Amino acid sequence: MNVDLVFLFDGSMSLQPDEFQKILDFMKDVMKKLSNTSYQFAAVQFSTSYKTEFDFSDYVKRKDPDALLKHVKHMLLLTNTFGAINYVATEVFREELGARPDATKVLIIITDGEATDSGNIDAAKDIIRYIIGIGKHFQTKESQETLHKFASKPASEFVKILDTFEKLKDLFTELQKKIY
Ligand SMILES: CN1C(=O)N(c2cc(Cl)cc(Cl)c2)C(=O)[C@]12CN(c1ccc(C(=O)O)cn1)C[C@H]2c1ccc(C#N)cc1
């Protein structure tokens, strides 16, 4: 349907270069698949700070995932996930930046660890929120639970755990199908 979807992706120092690249490729795969639909996309990299890599209006103008992401630079700092989610809620979903009043808001968060900051994400709560937690830091039920606070309910649907960044490929294949 009419979906305004934002990727919020981790660019902290704990991600290896190849891992950060797998994230970019995942986002391109998704966008390529949903070309020529009612989907609109935006992407934000977060680390210590929050960098909008492209807004919805950027997407409407070009609709080319390669061009939209070509200058992305890995920030290699902290993992301020609380600040990042609030940033998306208030700074990215705006009509002035191409967001649509009647579109469903979706936020896809991709990270390798726990947030380095703190607070709440009240402002983003109405958004449909998936979080993809990847790698060695999420190998136990207890470590995986730390992500639930960022996601819609139930966690069994909205929190995805991958053992490696190579599994983003497999996740895309699975997601591809859910497309009606
Ligand atoms: C199932 N589902 C889903 O897995 N994701 C999802 C989950 C992850 Cl981890 C990553 C990415 Cl990129 C997308 C979604 O966003 C949805 C929920 N959804 C919607 C859309 C609209 C409404 C609504 O209006 O209520 C509710 N949910 C759209 C749907 C979807 C499925 C596959 C792809 C691909 N490729 C992209 C989107």
- Output the domain CATH number for residue 122: 3.40.50.410
Of 87, 88, 86, 6, which is closest to residue 39 (Cα–Cα)? 6
* Tokens coding 37: 């639909």
**Residues of the domain holding 75:** 1-180
Closest ligand 1 atom, residue 171 Cα: 9
Alpha carbons 8 and 107: distance in angstroms, whole number: 7
Beta-sheet pairing, 39-46 with 128-134: unpaired
Q: How far is CA 76 from CA 15, 34, 158, in A?
A: 8, 30, 27
Tokens found for residue 166: 């190579």
- 26 CB less than 6 Å from ligand 1? no
Which position has the token pair 């979903």?
A: 93
Experimental method: X-ray
Closest ligand 1 atom to residue 157 Cα is 4
Q: How many domains does the chain have?
A: 1
Burial class (CB in 10 A: 0-12, 13-18, 19+), 167: middle
128 pocket-lining for ligand 1 (C-beta < 6 Å) = yes
Strands (E), 74-176: 104-111, 128-134, 159-162
What CA–CA distance (Å, rounded) separates 117 from 114? 9
What Cα–Cα distance (Å) separates residue 44 from each residue in 74, 119, 140?
12, 20, 28
How crowded is the C-beta side of 177, counted as CA atoms within 13 Å?
A: 4
How far is ligand 1, taken at its centre, from the CA of residue 84, in Å? 20
Q: Beta strands of 32-99 (E only): which ranges?
A: 39-46, 50-54
CA of 152 to the centre of ligand 1 (A): 12
Cα(117)–Cα(102) distance, integer angstroms: 32
**Element spanning 3, H or E:** strand 3-10
Cα-to-chain-centroid distance, residue 118: 19
CA of residue 72 relative to chain centroid, distance: 14
Q: HSE-up of 115 (CA within 13 Å, CB side)?
A: 21
Report how far residue 67's alpha carbon sits from residue 90's, in angstroms, rounded to the nearest whole number. 25
For residue 106, report the phi and psi dihedrals to the nearest 5 degrees: -130, 135
